[PDB]
């Protein structure tokens, strides 16, 4: 009686993968940095009752994931640069240029921005994927990121 979507959250250490997930699951912001596990969330997206199966990571998970949030932090230039490596990984495992993915630029609430929205838009355009800006602290963009990913999975494959 409901559709499962297997989502995987990837990106460099410290970017806010867990914080984003815990916002979606708990509606709370975890202040403290606790550096792999699985969460489930039932949600209605476009009148479909969805069971999200979310892997919060640090080939195994990549093989079976249906869509990926590729997360960097807007005050961490190295994390933005690292996106390439995560995307290449995902593409290799799937043997496809066409894998459901969203680029997420997290920590939008912080002042020390080193990656501008143009850099991020350029990257997402090159990849052919959406870009969503988030703050796990304020919850800005969090549902948007996850719901957009679900829509991208539907767009690619019958669910
Ligand atoms: N201000 C702010 N801090 C955040 C946000 N997202 C996460 N943080 C903080 O950044 C730190 C790292 O967040 P985590 O969610 O543990 O990062 P992670 O990507 O899961 O890191 P790993 O588990 O090491 O791969 C924590 O102190 C969070 O409180 C955000 O949107 N805004
Ligand atoms: Mg984490």
From Swiss-Prot:
Explain what the record says happens when changing residue 14 to R.
In pylocytic astrocytoma; somatic mutation; increase activation of the Ras pathway
Q: Which residues carry this modification: N-acetylmethionine?
A: 2
Post-translational modification, briefly? Acetylation at Lys-94 prevents interaction with guanine nucleotide exchange factors (GEFs). Lysine-depalmitoylation by SIRT2 promotes its localization to endomembranes in endocytic pathways.
The outcome of changing residue 37 to A is: Decreased interaction with MAPKAP1/SIN1
Q: What would changing residue 58 to T do, according to UniProt?
A: In GASC; also found in bladder cancer; somatic mutation
Keywords from the UniProt entry: Acetylation, Cardiomyopathy, Cell membrane, Cytoplasm, Deafness, Disease variant, Ectodermal dysplasia, Glycoprotein, GTP-binding, Hydrolase, Intellectual disability, Isopeptide bond, Lipoprotein, Membrane, Methylation, Nucleotide-binding, Palmitate, Prenylation, Proto-oncogene, Ubl conjugation
Under catalytic activity, the entry for this protein gives: GTP + H2O = GDP + phosphate + H(+)
Give the record's membrane topology.
Answer: Lipid-anchor
Phenotype when changing residue 136 to T: In OES; somatic mutation; also found in colorectal cancer samples
Q: Which residues bind GTP?
A: 11-19, 30-35, 106-109
Instruction: Please describe, based on the UniProt annotation, the reported consequence of changing residue 107 to N.
Output: In colorectal cancer samples; somatic mutation
Query: Which is a GO BP term held by this UniProt record?
Result: response to mineralocorticoid
| Classification via NCBIfam families | small_GTP
Disease named in the record? Leukemia, acute myelogenous: A subtype of acute leukemia, a cancer of the white blood cells. AML is a malignant disease of bone marrow characterized by maturational arrest of hematopoietic precursors at an early stage of development. Clonal expansion of myeloid blasts occurs in bone marrow, blood, and other tissue. Myelogenous leukemias develop from changes in cells that normally produce neutrophils, basophils, eosinophils and monocytes. Leukemia, juvenile myelomonocytic: An aggressive pediatric myelodysplastic syndrome/myeloproliferative disorder characterized by malignant transformation in the hematopoietic stem cell compartment with proliferation of differentiated progeny. Patients have splenomegaly, enlarged lymph nodes, rashes, and hemorrhages.
Subunit and partners: Interacts with PHLPP. Interacts (active GTP-bound form preferentially) with RGS14. Interacts (when farnesylated) with PDE6D; this promotes dissociation from the cell membrane. Interacts with SOS1. Interacts (when farnesylated) with GPR31. Interacts with RAP1GDS1. Interacts (active GTP-bound form) with both SHOC2 and PP1c (all isoforms) to form a tertiary complex; SHOC2 and PP1c preferably bind M-Ras/MRAS, but they also bind K-Ras/KRAS, N-Ras/NRAS and H-Ras/HRAS. Interacts (GTP-bound form) with MAPKAP1/SIN1; inhibiting K-Ras/KRAS activity.
Name the family. Answer: Belongs to the small GTPase superfamily. Ras family.
In Swiss-Prot or TrEMBL terms, this protein is called GTPase KRas
Gene encoding this chain?
KRAS
